[PDB]
Amino acid sequence: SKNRISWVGDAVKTDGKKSYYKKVCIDSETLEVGDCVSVIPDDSSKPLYLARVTALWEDSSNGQMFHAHWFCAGTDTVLGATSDPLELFLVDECEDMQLSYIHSKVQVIYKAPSGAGSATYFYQLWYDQDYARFESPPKTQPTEDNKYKFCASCARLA
Amino acid sequence: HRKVLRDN
Ligand SMILES: [Zn+2]
């Protein structure tokens, strides 16, 4: 909840009706144009709305405002849900909005296209096939007498 | 088109 709201810096453009700014302080946090921001929906139950702050201005009419450029999640698309809650999509949805509606500052990055990467097998845990369990890998050490042919599973199964 | 219509 944003209650203490102060402009940071002198105004960058003036409409003679709006006065635009580059930065605003809200509570302790400082927020610039291009930062991203979180908004609680009209339905508190629904997930948070996320947006980029594209402009900050003071209106003769209306007060201390910003323009939200919305993101949307998978569930707002043909896709239904999606594997990662952190996943987001650009969408051409906007709104002027009072700065006091801002829940929190958030971090949204762009994820450039990646390549397949190293296709190698990996393991993390040991499977006790007798008792149907996963443990952390047993740390059974070899001697220097049998290092050259050591099998950890021979060692335990003896 | 607006997406947040509450007032407070
Ligand atoms: Zn817009």
Author numbering:
A (entry chain A): 724 to 842, 859 to 897
B (entry chain F): 18 to 25
From the paper:
In mammals, DNA methylation is stably propagated by DNA methyltransferase 1 (DNMT1) during mitotic division. DNMT1 contains a C-terminal methyltransferase (MTase) domain, preceded by several regulatory domains including a replication-foci-targeting sequence (RFTS), a CXXC zinc finger domain and a pair of bromo-adjacent homology (BAH) domains. Here, we report that DNA methyltransferase 1 (DNMT1) specifically ‘recognizes’ H4K20me3 via its first bromo-adjacent-homology domain (DNMT1BAH1). Here, we show that DNMT1 directly recognizes H4K20me3 through the regulatory domain BAH1, which in turn mediates the chromatin association and enzymatic activation of DNMT1.
